[PDB]
Paper text:
Levansucrases (LSs) synthesize levan, a β2-6-linked fructose polymer, by successively transferring the fructosyl moiety from sucrose to a growing acceptor molecule. Recently, it was demonstrated that the LS from [name] ([name]) is capable of synthesizing polymer distributions with different molecular weights through two distinct elongation mechanisms. All of these structures display a single domain with a five-bladed β-propeller architecture, in which each β sheet adopts the classical “W” topology of four antiparallel β strands. In [name], residues D86 and E342 have been identified as the nucleophile and the general acid/base, respectively, whereas D247 is the transition state stabilizer.
In this work, we present the crystal structure of an inactive double-site mutant of [name] ([name]/[name]) in complex with levan-type hexasaccharides, which are intermediate products in the synthesis of LMW levans from sucrose. The crystal asymmetric unit contains two molecules of [name], chains A and B, each including residues 32 to 471. Each chain contains a hepta-coordinated Ca2+ ion, water molecules, and bromide ions in different sites, which are from the crystallization condition and two oligosaccharide molecules. Although the enzyme was cocrystallized with an octasaccharide, only the electronic densities of six fructose units bound by β2-6 glycosidic bonds were observable at the active site of both [name] molecules (oligosaccharide binding site 1, OB1 site). The levanhexaose molecule is oriented with its nonreducing end at the interior of the active site pocket and its reducing end protruding out of the central pocket. The levanhexaose is bound to the enzyme by 32 hydrogen bonds with the residues in the catalytic pocket, 12 to the side chains, 1 to the backbone, and the rest of the interactions with 11 residues through water molecules. In the [name]-levanhexaose structure, the oligosaccharide is used as a ligand, despite not being a donor substrate, and it is placed with its nonreducing end in an identical orientation to the fructosyl unit of sucrose and raffinose in their respective crystal structures, which allows us to define the −1, +1, +2, +3, and +4 subsites, beginning with the fructose unit inside the active site (−1) and ending with the fructose unit (+4) that extends toward the solvent. In this way, it can be established that the side chains of D117 and F182 participate in the +3 subsite, the former through a hydrogen bond with fructosyl 4 and the latter through a hydrophobic interaction. In the next subsite, the +4 subsite, residue Y237 forms CH/π stacking interactions with the fifth fructose unit of the ligand. Of interest, Y411, R360, and K363 show a different conformation in chain B, with the position of Y411 being similar to that of the apo [name] structure, while R360 and K363 shift their positions by 6.0 and 4.5 Å, respectively, away from their positions in chain A.
Numbering used by the authors: 32 to 471
Write the structure that this text describes.
Amino acid sequence: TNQKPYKETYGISHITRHDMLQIPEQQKNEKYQVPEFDSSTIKNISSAKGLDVWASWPLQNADGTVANYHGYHIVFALAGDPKNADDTSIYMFYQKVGETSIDSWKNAGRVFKDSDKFDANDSILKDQTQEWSGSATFTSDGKIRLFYTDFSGKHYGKQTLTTAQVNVSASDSSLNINGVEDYKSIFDGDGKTYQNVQQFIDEGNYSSGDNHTLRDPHYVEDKGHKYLVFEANTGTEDGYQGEESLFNKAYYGKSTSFFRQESQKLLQSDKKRTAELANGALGMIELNDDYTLKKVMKPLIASNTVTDEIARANVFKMNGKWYLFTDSRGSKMTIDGITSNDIYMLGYVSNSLTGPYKPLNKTGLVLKMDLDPNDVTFTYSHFAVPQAKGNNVVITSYMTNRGFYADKQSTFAPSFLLNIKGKKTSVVKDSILEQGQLTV
Ligand SMILES: OC[C@H]1O[C@@](CO)(OC[C@H]2O[C@@](CO)(OC[C@H]3O[C@@](CO)(OC[C@H]4O[C@@](CO)(OC[C@H]5O[C@@](CO)(OC[C@H]6O[C@](O)(CO)[C@@H](O)[C@@H]6O)[C@@H](O)[C@@H]5O)[C@@H](O)[C@@H]4O)[C@@H](O)[C@@H]3O)[C@@H](O)[C@@H]2O)[C@@H](O)[C@@H]1O
Ligand SMILES: OC[C@H]1O[C@@](CO)(OC[C@H]2O[C@@](CO)(OC[C@H]3O[C@@](CO)(OC[C@H]4O[C@@](CO)(OC[C@H]5O[C@@](CO)(OC[C@H]6O[C@](O)(CO)[C@@H](O)[C@@H]6O)[C@@H](O)[C@@H]5O)[C@@H](O)[C@@H]4O)[C@@H](O)[C@@H]3O)[C@@H](O)[C@@H]2O)[C@@H](O)[C@@H]1O
Ligand SMILES: [Br-]
Ligand SMILES: [Br-]
Ligand SMILES: [Br-]
Ligand SMILES: [Br-]
Ligand SMILES: [Br-]
Ligand SMILES: [Br-]
Ligand SMILES: [Ca+2]
């Protein structure tokens, strides 16, 4: 055949088959394992009575550290009725700084009223059916600036990175959401750098096996420049999905001998098409000072052949280096030895915000969680929260799968600590914090 191998990095970093195949052995080390949690201590968020509360994010200062909003910490979370998976709205919870109990989290309610997306006179928001995850920054002039994912069940799962300013009143006692403003779509994918939903739709959408994503926008600043880093998929010009992508050695790793081995297995494997379709990416755009789209930038990293889904993009500068993280499910990967119970947080390090990134702990493995989904202390959506001092970050996550238990809802997991040193990380032994704790 005249279809020959090649190597093209497209100028971006890559999560490779070589590195992923080392994780099943490496993940046996307790250094990379989410700690065992004691279910006897776990409570529902009492101020969110009856709602599942899952993927969540703190209001952050520009540097990623947790914001002090007039004496409060603020966390945005997705929540809704456990009996309806399509009930997904963003709620704002808060706690006085210094409190750490689960029962210190108060609930200011939903950020958005039903009419907000229609009052915005933004044509994409008119079609929103769910509010998916994001980030929130506390601006120089004291404003709460939210980014999140507008999901549209009406348009085959379209996902649009979206922003609003949340106007909140204080009261000694409680915080109040008075309304939102500057509510607008920012980016729905350009087709060339980031897949757009029209490519999903026209290739056959749900019956194609493709997984289109454009979500989880994370706000970050470098030198006054404003950016979103987000979960996406590559487009036509930066290593698109398809049979051809199986012939790019940059997706396999450094050795040509590993490449010919692994590629022939993959090409004749039951997971060939899944790997062809797999083209996840952590994308990056620059914003203008009014939070509109200024510049589409190339992905920080891509996961061609390995998975279509690298979620909850997170990036921050810590002690001189940039750390980039993403969550990913073993159930959607194509890597032998990685099982449908494996769940990971993967992590990468660079001297600059824009790359290039190198895998942490050699493989990119940072955290592994492999509890049965029915386990009450199952956790997902791990998220590294930068701290003002030291080498440790706080890992938040949600606990208990949505809708599984009548009386134990998805809740804030016990936080725990992750030590980050140069290119290596370690779960800090016996570092379990309160449920939902953001700071040490
Ligand atoms: O309180 C939450 C509760 O309300 C629902 C809406 O029923 O969620 C509304 C909440 O969701 C948010 C999030 O941003 O706004 C969603 C916005 O999008 C719309 C639609 O434009 O809602 C979509 C959700 O509603 C559902 C079903 O309730 O679909 C409506 C949608 O489905 C279609 C297609 O089949 O129709 C039909 C179905 O409905 C009946 O008429 C029953 O009444 C049947 O005859 C018929 O079989 C389509 O015609 C129609 O447009 C659901 O699939 C979607 O997720 C907005 O109305 C809404 O603002 C919140 O802002 C908002 O509070 C619900 O999901 C949830 O349980
Ligand atoms: O909660 C969001 C939050 O979670 C994070 C992680 O923290 O990750 C995403 C998480 O969400 C999951 C699943 O819950 O993965 C998402 C991926 O699954 C897809 C589909 O593969 O989306 C699911 C949503 O789309 C909906 C429908 O709008 O379901 C699609 C689903 O329904 C089927 C039938 O079951 O078809 C329905 C569809 O078919 C038609 O009839 C044809 O027209 C339509 O009328 C109708 O809409 C099925 O064929 C199809 O698979 C919605 O109900 C579902 O919720 C992907 O689009 C999506 O990428 C987790 O696995 C994952 O961790 C974070 O990233 C995020 O912010
Ligand atoms: Br409302
Ligand atoms: Br929906
Ligand atoms: Br195309
Ligand atoms: Br192709
Ligand atoms: Br193809
Ligand atoms: Br129960
Ligand atoms: Ca894909």
